[PDB]
């Protein structure tokens, strides 16, 4: 307690330490809430990217099913000199390729969203890693002062009023 004994001045310090500690607990549980929301975010985004993956897989399955149709029932729809009948797989092919391209672009959008949210989460995750040693150090200093400065004529109600501001 910076070798002080005014008692009243020593108590004023206790109130400054009160502020420091309280501010930390608020930012501490705020960082915990941020950790939880980022956790559920990457879980929702991984259930979305694996859905994207399985949809791309089944779309490639449809793409090879088009090649299967090019030998199953294409014999009666290409040698008759007609183009409107074949649109059920031919006009359903070019737009499927465009769908593949645009869902690949969407997957790239989800990947850049993933990396940007990971960056904005790690830029504060390192703050958590650095604020916790300082937090526990401040709490240890508060506990050490609570074993000396508090027994110099302050009341528990006074401590509650100091920590409640």
């Amino acid at each position: 307690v910076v070798k002080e004994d005014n008692i009243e001045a020593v108590g004023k310090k206790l109130h400054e330490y009160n502020t420091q500690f309280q501010e930390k607990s608020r930012e501490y549980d705020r960082l915990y809430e941020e950790y939880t929301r980022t956790s559920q975010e990457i879980q929702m985004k991984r259930t979305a990217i694996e859905a994207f993956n399985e949809t791309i897989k089944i779309f490639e399955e449809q793409c090879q099913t088009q090649e299967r149709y090019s030998k199953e029932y294409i014999e009666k729809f290409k040698r008759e000199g007609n183009e409107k009948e074949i649109q059920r797989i031919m006009h359903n092919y070019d737009k499927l390729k465009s769908r593949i391209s645009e869902i690949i672009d969407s997957r790239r959008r989800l990947e850049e969203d993933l990396k940007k949210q990971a960056a904005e989460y790690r830029e504060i995750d390192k703050r958590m890693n650095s604020i916790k040693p300082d937090l526990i150090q401040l709490r240890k200093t508060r506990d050490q002062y609570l074993m000396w400065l508090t027994q110099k004529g302050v009341r528990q109600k006074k401590l509650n009023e100091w920590l409640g501001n």
Binding site: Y28, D29, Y32, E33, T36, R37, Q40, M44, T47, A48, A51, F52, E54, T55, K57, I58, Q62, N92, K95, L96, R99, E102, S106, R109, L110, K132, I136
Partner: protein, 557 residues
């Protein structure tokens, strides 16, 4: 100072008296042979059409006889009666012709009144006709409202004759909308097929535009059935609220492929003091709670009812004293998350037992005991007619009674007695009494058996509709219970004062099995007076607000 209202109404009533006796009649309107003497000033002040016709200074302002064509005599009389009074007789039989005459005459007041009346009169039987009317007359608000109504109940209205007589633009703007409430794309495909085959000689050229709007390569929820259901418990709902959003809107799963069965909690107490009577809906499948803007007038004490067609309604209740009791009836728009009011009830009620029977919603009791015959009154509402009809009242005055519906029959239970109502007979029949006298109990119809659970001490009492006998089953595994049927299985959402957990009951084995725990990660204290029900809602665009830190009680030590 300015225009005095005291002389204004006297001048208006004097003008009406002069018009009734035909004084100073300067113009004579001829409609299909019928003559109408009237004043040019009144028609100019009321209708801008007559104003422009008279202020042109041509022979129309000099000739006393003006022939108006394509105008109905009754509609013109209503316009002129309104022109000399201010009362508009708007009925559901002649509202469209009145609106047509008004738009032909450009009466801003009559136009706005008919527009708002048609907007508050969109049901599931005239939506398509009103949409075609608004498209023909270019009314953007009515057009949007009718389009939303069609998108809400497309699978129920695509069979009407008005749907096959729609224009090309209406079809291409309805089919292209992602708000189609359909469980499968085959329904929309068959709708397009029947529309194109209704009149082939005139629509043979539109087959390409028809096929270009129906999503064929979408494969919304079949691809999940191909690979597997392998995920965290029932995580297909996460794919619904994920893949749908990010989609080029050509292969988008329609809104009907997005509805999920969620436990609807209304009047659920909220941590936020301002809304101490909030309403949230926890999804058992998605394991997520979604915020609702349920209160339309910050009131409470309103009952809940979910029709088999998945429609939500609230009625009764009282607003804070600006606690005056009201009659407002609100229907929930599952797409816009906003309640639209309906025709108010005939008698004010507090938490009325609202149940759906044979397409009608019945208001049973739910009011303080006032008057012998004045209380115990039962009233039902007609959905398409937007009206309330009184029925045989309750035999005795009860309190905290529940109501269910089984096999199109109405059942209300009380302390120890039970009465069954038949709409075909409109009478009350006392049924098998219960061995226990209890209050505040919750009831839910499941199959051919009515479950009576509660008492304020929990006992599961099973009634048989086919046997008219009460048999004991078990006790609620525990008390604040909410018996609701979901996933085609009877369940009870119990709140252990608070802990939340849902149990599953076996009807054959007469045993209660633990179904799913509701961790305190979300779903905070919802109080004890909250009403609960089961309904399907779109989480896609309902609301997104967690409001609750899933972790607390720091363990760093």
């Amino acid at each position: 100072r300015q225009i005095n209202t005291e002389y204004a109404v006297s001048l208006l009533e004097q003008l009406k008296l002069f018009y009734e006796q035909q004084l100073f009649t300067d113009i004579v309107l001829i409609v299909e042979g019928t003559e109408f003497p009237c004043h040019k000033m009144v028609l100019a002040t009321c209708s801008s059409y007559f104003r422009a016709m008279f202020m042109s200074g041509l022979s129309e302002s000099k000739q006393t006889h003006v022939h108006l064509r394509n105008v109905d005599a009754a509609t013109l009389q209503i316009i002129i009666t309104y022109a000399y009074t201010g009362n508009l007789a708007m009925n559901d039989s002649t509202v469209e012709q009145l609106y047509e005459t008004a738009c032909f005459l450009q009466v801003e007041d009559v136009l706005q009144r008919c527009r708002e009346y048609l907007i508050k009169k969109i049901n599931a039987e005239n939506c398509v006709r009103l949409l075609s009317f608004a498209d023909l007359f270019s009314c953007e608000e009515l057009k949007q409202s009718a389009k939303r109504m069609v998108e809400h109940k497309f699978t129920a209205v695509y069979h009407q004759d008005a749907f096959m007589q729609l224009s090309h633009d209406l079809l291409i703007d309805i089919l292209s909308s992602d708000n189609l409430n359909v469980e499968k794309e085959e329904t929309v495909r068959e709708a397009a097929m029947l529309w194109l085959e209704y009149n082939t000689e005139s629509r043979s050229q539109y087959l390409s535009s028809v096929l270009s709007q129906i999503r064929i390569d979408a494969l919304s929820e079949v691809t999940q059935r191909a690979w597997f259901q392998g995920l965290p418990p029932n995580d297909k709902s996460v794919v619904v609220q994920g893949l749908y959003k990010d989609m080029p809107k050509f292969f988008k799963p329609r809104l009907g492929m997005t509805k999920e069965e969620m436990m609807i909690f209304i009047e659920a107490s909220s941590e936020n003091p301002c809304s101490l009577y909030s309403s949230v809906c926890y999804s058992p499948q998605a394991e997520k709670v979604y915020k609702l803007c349920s209160p339309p007038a910050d009131l409470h004490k309103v009952g809940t009812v979910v029709t088999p067609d998945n429609d939500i309604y609230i009625a009764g209740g009282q607003v804070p004293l600006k606690f005056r009791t009201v009659n407002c009836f609100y229907w929930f728009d599952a797409q816009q998350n906003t309640w639209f009011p309906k025709t108010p009830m005939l008698f004010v009620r507090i938490k009325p037992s609202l149940v759906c029977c044979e397409g009608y919603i019945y208001a049973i009791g739910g009011d303080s005991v006032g008057g012998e015959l004045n209380r115990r009154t039962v009233e039902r509402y007609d959905t398409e007619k937007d009206e309330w009809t009184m029925v045989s009242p309750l035999p005795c005055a009860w309190q905290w009674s529940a109501a269910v519906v089984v096999h199109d029959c109405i059942y209300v239970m009380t302390l120890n007695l039970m009465y069954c109502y038949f709409p075909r007979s409109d009478s009350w029949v006392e049924m098998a009494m219960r061995q226990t006298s209890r209050s505040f109990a919750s009831a839910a119809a499941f199959g051919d058996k009515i479950f009576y659970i509660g008492g304020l001490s929990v006992t599961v009492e099973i009634y048989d509709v086919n046997k008219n006998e009460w048999k004991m089953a078990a006790n609620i595994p525990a008390p604040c219970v909410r018996a609701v049927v979901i996933s085609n299985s009877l369940c009870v959402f119990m709140r252990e004062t608070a802990k939340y957990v849902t149990y599953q009951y076996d009807l054959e084995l007469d045993r209660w099995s633990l179904r799913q725990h509701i961790s305190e990660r979300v779903l905070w204290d919802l109080g004890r007076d909250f009403r609960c029900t089961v309904g399907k809602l779109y989480p896609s665009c309902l609301e997104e607000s967690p409001w609750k830190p899933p972790t607390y009680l720091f363990s760093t030590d």
